[PDB]
UniProtKB/Swiss-Prot annotation:
Species name: Mycobacterium tuberculosis (strain CDC 1551 / Oshkosh)
Gene Ontology molecular-function annotations: ATP binding; magnesium ion binding; shikimate kinase activity
CDD domains: SK (cd00464)
UniProt-listed Gene3D superfamilies: P-loop containing nucleotide triphosphate hydrolases
Pathway(s): Metabolic intermediate biosynthesis; chorismate biosynthesis; chorismate from D-erythrose 4-phosphate and phosphoenolpyruvate: step 5/7
Gene Ontology cellular component terms for the protein in this record: cytosol
Amino-acid positions noted as binding Mg(2+) in the UniProt annotation, renumbered to this chain: S15
Reported cofactor(s): Mg(2+)
UniProt KW NAD keyword: no
Protein name as it appears in the record: Shikimate kinase
Cofactor note: Binds 1 Mg(2+) ion per subunit.
Reaction(s) catalysed by this chain's protein: shikimate + ATP = 3-phosphoshikimate + ADP + H(+)
Residues the record lists as binding substrate: D33, R57, G79, R133
Amino acid sequence: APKAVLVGLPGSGKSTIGRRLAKALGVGLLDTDVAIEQRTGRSIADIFATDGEQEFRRIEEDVVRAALADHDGVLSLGGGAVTSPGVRAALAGHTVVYLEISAAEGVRRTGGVRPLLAGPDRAEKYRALMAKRAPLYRRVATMRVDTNRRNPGAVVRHILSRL
Ligand SMILES: Nc1ncnc2c1ncn2[C@@H]1O[C@H](COP(=O)(O)OP(=O)(O)O)[C@@H](O)[C@H]1O
Ligand SMILES: O=C(O)C1=C[C@@H](O)[C@@H](O)[C@H](O)C1
Ligand SMILES: [Cl-]
Ligand SMILES: [Cl-]
Ligand SMILES: [Cl-]
């Protein structure tokens, strides 16, 4: 089982903190998004525009379950994995770190790709994403970490200390 599973909105820091957390613990980082693009050979943005969410979610879910079982390092899920009921059930019992972030900072971090965030009105879309998913992240989380006024190193240490 992963030493920690990272969840949160896009831009909350799953990929960044996961890497640094991994390097700290001395284990590998498995980023479900990355893993996906491999089992598919295609990019996530292309799977979205070619198969849609329901399909990306089933793939994601299959990767997540596998990772939860075979990966002992740090696991970082895709921003919306928690929307799949199967992913939420598979997480039960695991160490799940919920990286919290405000909508203002979150949107500014994701400035620069995300199929669900992209295009105009990212502030509105980001906020909608938060309203929808906030409840889900909180349900699966065993550890909530506020990343608003904490630089990466501080978030990593805050987590390391509570593991
Ligand atoms: N604690 C933090 N404070 C400052 N910037 C951060 C923090 N965590 C993440 N970032 C930055 O925010 C951007 C998105 O982080 P990323 O790990 O890609 O998010 P996610 O994997 O959740 O989409 C990156 O450029 C990263 O350097
Ligand atoms: O918030 C989401 O639904 C997503 C976030 C990214 O990490 C990727 O998993 C993909 O772009 C979907
Ligand atoms: Cl399983
Ligand atoms: Cl590992
Ligand atoms: Cl299960």
